[model samples]
Target: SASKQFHNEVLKAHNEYRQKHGVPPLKLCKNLNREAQQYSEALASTRILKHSPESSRGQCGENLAWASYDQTGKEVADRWYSEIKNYNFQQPGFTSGTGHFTAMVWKNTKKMGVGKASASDGSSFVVARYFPAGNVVNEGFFEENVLPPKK
Candidate 1:
């Protein structure tokens, strides 16, 4: 499923990115499970790009981006863009959105002292809606749909 693959890639990329940035991974999200599930659903419903002017793939890309921001923050996002700017997506269709999201997570992990074994709690979202998409920006989905339900 596109969602499943998308989420998996996002998580994996985020972890790798975190390692590069020297930050702890995002292991503390309350809605990680829900976020994961949505990705799965998305994957199951994916179809070939319709080749029409309206088939922009925006939902797919935005969903992945939302997941990334939910896991990390904006700074990592910038770095992710830098890393994938020249990526070759033809042969196997490079995983761009997911990879970018992961990088953001990784960047934030470092900022929050993810694996330092320290007492730091890292950065806070302040308001979950403050995240890039604010529940409405990601294609037509909301954070509540992708992010795990708050405990």
Candidate 2:
């Protein structure tokens, strides 16, 4: 089924583009196919799709922070500090240093509830998110919630 779709949509279009441009054939077909299969599997797995508890959230946050640091630089931590203030979820807790951050860990299940509840816990996770370098918070909000209309 995926192969059929790939052949009809991606392969056909890529071939046409290559023909028009006179470029060599794509070199990473096997790797690309494996990646496509992985994506397909990920899309079909619902549990993998929707497990967003504190642990999962913390993982996602840590990953983002690490990517920010690895890809950019230390200034990112300061940016995260200011932008996190308005997150509506838990305030992004940081370490004593500028770019070091870890999700605040709650003592118990009741303590680790939702945004405001989790935020009140005060203690941050032992393994925190650290940005070696980069401006973590470039744009303030992750997504704009304002109503439609161009500026």
Candidate 3:
């Protein structure tokens, strides 16, 4: 259920961005489909790490942190020094007893000065890397976590 929720949120954000930018909605795109499948698999199985308010480490040493770990418990990606905001679910026809949804933004340490988006619930995220010319070199939903496959 959480994975499904996570997947829908990411897709909803993607569609919203497309609409805002006047790019046609992303539907039937093979590349998007493949990436979505990959994200679904990883989020469904990854270990979620939530922020600890009482600890000085403060969830990876910053406020409002969330991350996912691999099967071996190695952190694949994380958002630190994040600022989170709570809002009513944006997707139509969706309501939960758990109440509001949360979204967050933070600087990506792996790529200085680059921004990243993440779900407060730790279910979804996006990482973007840019070229020196300010053009985007890599950008996608949880694409940073896609390690090379073994032979």
Tell me, by lDDT, which candidate is best: 1
The lDDT values for all models are 0.31, 0.26, 0.26
Error of 1 at 60 (Å): 14
Looking at candidate 2, the ten consecutive residues that score lowest on lDDT are: 109-118
**On residues 25-50, what C-alpha lDDT tens digit does candidate 1 reach at each position?**
54433344344343333332442112
By TM-score: ranked, best first: 1, 3, 2
How do all models score by TM-score? 0.29, 0.24, 0.26
Residues 90-109, candidate 2, lDDT per residue (tens digit)? 33323333222212211110
lDDT of 1 at 138: 34
Per-residue accuracy of model 3 over 1-151 as CA lDDT, tens digit each: 5433443443454334334323333322333334434433333344343322321222121112223421110121111101111122232121121111111111121211111233435453332111111111144421222112122
Using TM-score as the measure, which candidate wins?
A: 1
- In model 2, the Cα lDDT at residue 61 comes to 28
Candidate 2: list runs displaced more than 4 Å: 1-5, 47-151
Kindly give the stretch of ten consecutive residues in candidate 1 with the minimal lDDT sum: 110-119
Q: Candidate 2 has which clashing residue pairs, if any? A: 73-133, 73-134, 74-133, 74-134, 76-134, 76-135, 76-136, 101-129, 102-128
